[PDB]
Design a protein around this ligand. Sequence first.
Ligand code: SF4
Ligand code: SF4
Ligand code: SF4
Lengths: 620, 620
Amino acid sequence: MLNLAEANSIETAWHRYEKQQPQCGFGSAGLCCRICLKGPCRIDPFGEGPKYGVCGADRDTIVARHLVRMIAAGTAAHSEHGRHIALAMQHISQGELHDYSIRDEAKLYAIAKTLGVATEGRGLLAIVGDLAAITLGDFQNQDYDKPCAWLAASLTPRRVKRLGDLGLLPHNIDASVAQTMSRTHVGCDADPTNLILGGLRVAMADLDGSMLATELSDALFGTPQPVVSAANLGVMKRGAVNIAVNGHNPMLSDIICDVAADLRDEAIAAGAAEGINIIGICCTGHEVMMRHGVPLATNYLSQELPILTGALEAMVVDVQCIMPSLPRIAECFHTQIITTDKHNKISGATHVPFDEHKAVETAKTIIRMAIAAFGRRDPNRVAIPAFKQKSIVGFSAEAVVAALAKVNADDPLKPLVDNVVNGNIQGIVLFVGCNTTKVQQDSAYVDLAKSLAKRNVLVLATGCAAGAFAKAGLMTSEATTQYAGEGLKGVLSAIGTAAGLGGPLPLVMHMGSCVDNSRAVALATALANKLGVDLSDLPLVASAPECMSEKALAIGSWAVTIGLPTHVGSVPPVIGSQIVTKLVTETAKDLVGGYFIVDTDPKSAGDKLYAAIQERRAGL
Amino acid sequence: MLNLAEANSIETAWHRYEKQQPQCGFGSAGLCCRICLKGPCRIDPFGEGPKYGVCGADRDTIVARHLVRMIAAGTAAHSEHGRHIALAMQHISQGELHDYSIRDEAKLYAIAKTLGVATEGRGLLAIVGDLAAITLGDFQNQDYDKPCAWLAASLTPRRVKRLGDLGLLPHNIDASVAQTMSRTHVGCDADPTNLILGGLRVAMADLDGSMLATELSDALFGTPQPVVSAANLGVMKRGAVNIAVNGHNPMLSDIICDVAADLRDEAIAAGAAEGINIIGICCTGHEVMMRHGVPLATNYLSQELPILTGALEAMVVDVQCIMPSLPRIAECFHTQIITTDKHNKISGATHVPFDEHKAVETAKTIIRMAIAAFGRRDPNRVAIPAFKQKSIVGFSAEAVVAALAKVNADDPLKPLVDNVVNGNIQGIVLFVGCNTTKVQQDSAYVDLAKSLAKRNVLVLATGCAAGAFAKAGLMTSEATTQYAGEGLKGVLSAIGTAAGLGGPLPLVMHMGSCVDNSRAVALATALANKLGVDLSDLPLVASAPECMSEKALAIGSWAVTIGLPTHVGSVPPVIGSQIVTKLVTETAKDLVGGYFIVDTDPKSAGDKLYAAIQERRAGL
Ligand code: SF4
Ligand code: SF4
Ligand code: SF4
């Protein structure tokens, strides 16, 4: 926890959770079913109740069909973000979408290198078209046996073989989601094993979306490089127009950032002495935190609380992980919750649609409204907590290897590799996932982080996990000296002073939004290649102690298919099926290297994670 | 009904249904969300308790989001069928796939006239090459404002403009299923009106898949023409090896049927003096019956009873509506449940994969596995009820027009309209639907047809609904002379005796499988184009007295969006929201012209349907 801005008149996410107590144990068990209108069909595993549904389907085919349908939804969620980015890149290539451009042409040529596109003497718009045509191809191929272009280009070669031999390499992101929906229909795919393999194949179609999203978003806006930022509710200035950007797509926020600069004088004119101060919520808040250093107000669960300070002039949303309660809560104040997307309206908000073509003028309209919301701000109701915590963020996979080249420009990975074979770094944990109410907010992350840090493992974080470490200052050079542990701290401070920081590198390491989890794969696959090996051999581990979204389920599943022991700290609906639970814990260990780790205890989970790393080290 | 193989000590669909009593009711009203792993949050409508989910979404977001995902899983189910035909038509245009070919070169040409393929002096394979490309574009177009190819080309140009101006013409089948699962992810679309409107678009994609599948499948296997067949379990033979074909895809069955004939001389040699008995279950059987007249054993709920006869040697199952209990109901006997699709495997059943490049060869293998099970049939455990109801089927839209051309070959549609303005044909009804255990099998189907036919309205049917009418004897000439009203019986008898068949046209005309519901919208659009109107003005109505599947919910949802008053007889999860209910029942009569009629009383349904039929006659 952290802030505690007591409503005392208003329902919040914590209130609505307790009024749901107790929650249906059937659904939490995975023994609920509503796929056809002959249900609802439940399974009584014990006292001689119904052991089958009207379908004839058992507990295992019921639990599994819902597992992969959840993975499929999270894949559809991530892929819709990457599709907008690739559709842009196709418009940038055709002299259209003028408000956008290739702001990082260095990242663009490197993307075309990993994809095989010629760049020598070709001109920018030709490469961009070759890059958009390929990336759109992953959304339209019908040859079930042709892997996704980004997957084949971006994994280790050993992994590409392992999955293609099992048919786990997707051919089409849209078709993977749709073929998962169709096969889980009433009376279609039954076999729990065929089902779970079908969820792992569509989990890879999520990885594709996350890769092409991160890479082409860099080329659109710039690769993150280390920057100083600040987190928590304190970053709201009373003397400023406070604009919260919540959602996922930086195509809106990165434009709002630039327009917020030229529009400062209108903020001062309306009576805001400190201009307009835009703040970030959730993954779009991380995108502009990663890139431009814009502060991060809060992560997921505490996203209604900015309106509670009585000084949020407008919260601009687009898609995903935004709470439908926000038009209700903002009606008690002056706040303007502004929806933007064609496929993301909240009843009671204010919709201004984002014409990507007319981008910077739609921004002005948005900021003009929030300047006018400042006009109706009640001044004796402002109550901003003074919690602002600083954090060094912007640690893209590119920048991390750059700071290593301040230690060895010849072999930039050699310090990392050498410091692993000797034990200063026992391993790497990547903290992923959102916020759940069945885990005390931010506590499981911080418990796990310092426990594993102390054990000499490097911590990387993304999304609402990096947001939970951002606040509570584990993203500081000081957090490294206090909790790292000697061997881990010795290296962390070496690179930390090689690149001009001021101390060591922060304990945890921001890599960005959930799609930017593809950065750590790029980090790890290059490592796995330097050693001439695969990720199912590296002392590498993922952990989602507080996960909820279907994205978190899809993200975690391809973390298994890639080779990582993946810790889940919020129990998916599998416990009702011992057979499915065997499939993802055992069996996965053998087929695909990675495996799941379901533990609700942050202390005992970090014991299995270190054990997984220590077992992983032994294999070398 | 009528058969019911009351078998002792074996569990069936009805036995498994009654084990589930009572079923949740929260899920029946749609007041259980189940998306985000912080739930399952449920809504209490009356006595205090929880009024929201933890994300903050009200009952109307929870209800709308689940309905819209059922529409998407139903579109994915049908679209995957259509994509198989389209890929086959592409291997066909290139010289791959030597077992399949353009059997109805005629159909191929009329499919190309409309939809705009140029034919003038062009080889057949160039014409079917353009057809394969255009149709595959409906699965890969990324221009959001580019309507689907078939949709624009196939339904009335007035409805093209309406749905276009409402934004309901889909641009891509695969991306409509995906953008649906994404926008219904946690924290995404929440406005009830927006969600159900987006579900109306992913429903118009099920019309696309159904359209291309039906039309293209005809060119590959032949456009159905009137054929006499037989229905019910009495279609099995003890002196023949009985092979059942369940599922949906005709690409398998049509082969199996042809190969069975060439493999008759090996059957008799093994002891099957009557050869290969290929019986049909669900839609695969409907496809081959409509085209070749093969017998249909049963529909959905009674697909396990053919095993109880002790005379089923194999059940070759491909995709969709295949009960997972069948492998368990075998073993008890000698039957071989044989799965074929890589995305449709059932634990305990024998899987031999179906390569379409090696269709006939695979076919022979399957059939041989059954002629081996014939030599394992316990002859002391045979029990074929001997219910063989003769059925006249094969009534494609083309066949209907031809019969109306045997009376007026200059204005073939004039006999229809004239008899609708005078009153002899008060209207038409399309009976779609499956089979649910909450309504006695086939009961409401039969009752609703007779009550309406007496009121002088033509009865058309598809799928398991048509199977119910076939096994009941409403698909014969005598049924018209008995239950049809005077005016209707007159027109039917005239066209009949004028188009051979020596009698009146069947009371219920078999229009085909689920995808063949596009034949009814074809006939309707043609009549509406002869009268200068839209389907929203024709006295046309759809009814699903025993729906249960997601495909049916989608099949009914595009019927509403094309302008048809649709009746549902199983109550979708919608009662929990009066807003969503009103949106799909009342405000749809203002936006898209069609609407839903939830009743569940078969008597009150027909009264309301006839009221709508007569209301459409007020106009015109
Ligand atoms: S539908 Fe299933 S998860 Fe929802 S309350 Fe009922 S038993 Fe529980
Ligand atoms: S799909 Fe089968 S197990 Fe699921 S609700 Fe329907 S009848 Fe029950
Ligand atoms: S999206 Fe909201 S209502 Fe639905 S399960 Fe999650 S928290 Fe509950």
